[PDB]
Amino acid sequence: RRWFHPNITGVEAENLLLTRGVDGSFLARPSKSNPGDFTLSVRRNGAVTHIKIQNTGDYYDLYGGEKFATLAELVQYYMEHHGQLKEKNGDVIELKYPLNCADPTSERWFHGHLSGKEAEKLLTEKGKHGSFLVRESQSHPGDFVLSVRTGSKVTHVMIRCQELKYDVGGGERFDSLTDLVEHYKKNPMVETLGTVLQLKQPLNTT
């Protein structure tokens, strides 16, 4: 169950496998090119490959080979029986490390579900000049928001996410939320109406 990712594309899977993955990392996800089939996305030698999984309704297979009633039995099988999964050339593909579904970051300044009014609240009565956090967007599902204290109020800056690639309405697009926060720690961003939005200290979640 853990290595299944319900709502990601092949490009977010590759970028996942290259950022949080290693060689031998893999994940399952639905098929975007063809619902509702599935896809094994796997990392080997620093590159990412995808494998079609057929769902007839009675079984799951890799369009050949063994037939399994469920998706987990198929993945489990191909994890345990290394060698059974061969490309035509001769190279075998290894399912070694599942890549478990998780948050966009593990960093403490990521509060997750947290609205602008309650984030504004914490940043008032616990944030000082430069305290910031990143939080999910509630007006644009799938996207994020950097809330900052520029003392004597709080600013919100929509962080867009397109295929696991993050920017603040343009400029550079970082591979994770961490690269964005660190880059803009070194490099304060300037709001249209003049306020410069320095990031001094993260307001970590308790």
């Binding site: 494998i51 050949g64 080979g65 999964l85 061969k86 490309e87």
Partner: peptide, 9 residues
């Protein structure tokens, strides 16, 4: 994204 064909032939 590159898609690998699995050989059972």
């Amino acid at each position: 994204p590159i898609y690998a064909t699995i050989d059972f032939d």
